[PDB]
Amino acid sequence: SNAQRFEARIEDGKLYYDKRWYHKSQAIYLESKDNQKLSCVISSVGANEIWVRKTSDSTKMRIYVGQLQRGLFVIRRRS
């Protein structure tokens, strides 16, 4: 697949996105046009999906690896 704007995958149980490593406890900012910078902390890293937890809403947000590779979400790391 060449349709990749961001290189992302899950390696050794950690998130490898934007050529940068993310922890399981990782705090990250998800920002978009129709979505402001969400200060969210990852709760668990799966195989094809990452579970990030909204600090405010306390809900679980499941992001798929493929969606990150297409560049659906812009994730900035804070660690």
Instruction: State which residues form the domain around 64.
Output: 8-78
Flag whether 67 is in a domain: yes
Residue 14 belongs to a domain: yes
Distances (CA, A) of 33 to 13, 44, 60, 72: 30, 26, 21, 11
Residues contacting 3, CB < 8 A, separation 6+ = 70
Cα(17)–Cα(10) distance, integer angstroms: 8
3 within domain boundaries = no
Helices (H) and strands (E) in the chain, counts: 1, 8
Identify which of 61, 56, 55 has the alpha carbon closest to the alpha carbon of residue 27: 55
Tell me whether residue 13 is in a domain. Answer: yes
CB atoms within 10 A of CB 39: 13
Domain count of the fold of the chain: 1
